[PDB]
Amino acid sequence: YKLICYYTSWSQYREGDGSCFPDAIDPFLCTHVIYSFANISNNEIDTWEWNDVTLYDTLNTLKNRNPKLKTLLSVGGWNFGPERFSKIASKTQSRRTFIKSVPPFLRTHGFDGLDLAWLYPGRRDKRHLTALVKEMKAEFAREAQAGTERLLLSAAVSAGKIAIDRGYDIAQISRHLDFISLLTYDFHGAWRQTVGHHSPLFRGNSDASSRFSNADYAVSYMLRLGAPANKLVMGIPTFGRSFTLASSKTDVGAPISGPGIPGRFTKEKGILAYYEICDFLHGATTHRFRDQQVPYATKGNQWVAYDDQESVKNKARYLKNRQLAGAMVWALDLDDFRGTFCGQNLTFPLTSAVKDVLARV
């Protein structure tokens, strides 16, 4: 069982305790840690924050306390134009230049692999996406000839039926990717105004349309398109999505006027870190969609959908019963990394819960 964990580079800037560096990571918690978002310039992989070289180095030293740890660097992300990616993949000339530029870069900074986070391929990208992966892996097999351990190659994929049908050739890229991470937590549309859970586990007996929006369906679909169970990694949120109610209605279906208010440390509308949700929970009413098996809390005119220890152990068991390769946790830095915000003196509550379940059988 794999436990891929993402560490986001821009979490250093957060004020107070909110600040997180490679430093705070438990060497023995995850199996793969993915440093989040490198850039591309002149069709060549490159750093993003000025001190990426120092943090790169800082993270890669964890491999000194734990030999078996493996780290990878991710390319793209949400603040990286889709188009920008799409331009590089279409022109074989500019694509080969990018591919040729990765090995070196990783070997120098100490990573054991690359992670592609092209955030959403369009109908016109599917063919090139397949080209990019295919060729990139060929490059990695060829470079292992130099007598060093072959670099890994993976990818962050959407879990939206429509998104997959539109831009991914799952059967084709499944064979060159070392492992695939399903973004099973972006389900409730950024578009419409209705309270809903972004990462539901199950269909949920009460609501006909868009059953395609839950981890279970996303997973069953990928297996059908051709992805091997031994390459799928299911995504698990370590954050919550907030909304500002537009009425005293709190139950499934209630009106919304927009995202929720900012977090004191997170400072971003609509999102809250797990440690912020821990402080928010005080004096809030909790609820739990029994059909989907996922939380939600309300307080004042704020309605928050999130994941606790139990909702997370649940997804972990599911993951196991379908025999998937493992779990993926988005943001170690959104988890209670210090462990001084959520009751129990434990550190990394959620990611640990996933790990305990994974080490069972």
Ligand X SMILES: *[C@@H]1O[C@H](CO)[C@@H](O[C@H]2O[C@H](CO)[C@@H](O[C@H]3O[C@H](CO)[C@@H](O)[C@H](O)[C@@H]3O)[C@H](O)[C@H]2NC(C)=O)[C@H](O)[C@H]1NC(C)=O
Chain center to CA of 360:
23
Query: How many residues touch ligand X (CB under 6 A)?
Result: 3
Residue for token pair 């129990």: 344
| Residue 109 CB, nearest approach to ligand X (Å) | 16
Task: Say whether residue 41 binds ligand X (CB under 6 A).
Answer: yes
Question: Do the annotations mark residue 184 as ligand-binding?
Answer: yes
Q: What are the angstrom distances between the C-alpha of 39 and each of 43, 73, 110, 309, 337? A: 10, 10, 17, 34, 26
| Residue 58 CB, nearest approach to ligand X (Å) | 20
Specify the residue, 36 or 130, whose C-beta has the smaller distance to ligand X: 36
Other C-beta atoms closer than 10 Å to the C-beta of 2 total 17
CB under 8 Å to 295, separation ≥6 — which residues? 286, 287, 288, 289, 305, 306, 307, 308, 311
Question: Do the annotations mark residue 279 as ligand-binding?
Answer: no
Specify the residue, 79 or 257, whose C-beta has the smaller distance to ligand X: 79
State the DSSP H helix or E strand holding residue 173, giving kind and residue range, or none if neither.
Answer: helix 170-174
| Residue 90 CB, nearest approach to ligand X (Å) | 15
Could you tell me the end-to-end alpha-carbon distance of the chain, in angstroms, rounded to an integer?
A: 10
Q: 258 is written with which tokens?
A: 């927009």
Q: 211 is written with which tokens?
A: 């059953």
Question: Do the annotations mark residue 50 as ligand-binding?
Answer: yes
Phi, psi of 238 (to 5 degrees): -130, 15
Specify the residue, 26 or 46, whose C-beta has the smaller distance to ligand X: 46
| Residue 337 CB, nearest approach to ligand X (Å) | 25
Specify the residue, 41 or 209, whose C-beta has the smaller distance to ligand X: 41
| Residue 354 CB, nearest approach to ligand X (Å) | 32
Q: How many residues does the chain have?
A: 361
Query: Can you tell me the distance from the alpha carbon of 143 to that of 259, in angstroms, rounded to the nearest whole number?
Result: 47
Site string for ligand X, 54-83 (x = CB under 6 A): ------------------------------
Query: Can you tell me the distance from the alpha carbon of 227 to that of 207, in angstroms, rounded to the nearest whole number?
Result: 28
Task: Say whether residue 48 binds ligand X (CB under 6 A).
Answer: yes
Question: Do the annotations mark residue 263 as ligand-binding?
Answer: no
DSSP letter assigned to residue 261: P
Chain center to CA of 61:
23
Question: Do the annotations mark residue 241 as ligand-binding?
Answer: yes
Other C-beta atoms closer than 10 Å to the C-beta of 346 total 13
Question: Do the annotations mark residue 60 as ligand-binding?
Answer: no
Task: Say whether residue 50 binds ligand X (CB under 6 A).
Answer: no
Question: Do the annotations mark residue 110 as ligand-binding?
Answer: no
Specify the residue, 26 or 44, whose C-beta has the smaller distance to ligand X: 44
Q: What are the angstrom distances between the C-alpha of 135 and each of 8, 95, 159, 180, 227? A: 27, 9, 24, 17, 19
Q: Check: CB of residue 231 under 8 Å from CB of residue 325.
A: yes
Q: Which residue is nearest to ligand X (CB)?
A: 41
| Residue 33 CB, nearest approach to ligand X (Å) | 22
Specify the residue, 43 or 311, whose C-beta has the smaller distance to ligand X: 43
| Residue 49 CB, nearest approach to ligand X (Å) | 8
Specify the residue, 39 or 301, whose C-beta has the smaller distance to ligand X: 39
Secondary structure percentages of the chain, helix, strand, coil, to 5: 35, 25, 40
| Residue 105 CB, nearest approach to ligand X (Å) | 14
Out of 12, 19, 39, 301, the only residue in the binding site for ligand X (CB under 6 A) is 39
Task: Say whether residue 90 binds ligand X (CB under 6 A).
Answer: no
Specify the residue, 82 or 339, whose C-beta has the smaller distance to ligand X: 82
Task: Say whether residue 97 binds ligand X (CB under 6 A).
Answer: no
Instruction: List, as residue ranges, the binding site for chitin.
Output: 49-50, 76-79, 120, 183-186, 241, 330
- What is the contact surface with ligand X in residues (CB under 6 A)? 39, 41, 48
Instruction: List, as residue ranges, the binding site.
Output: 49-50, 76-79, 120, 183-186, 241, 330
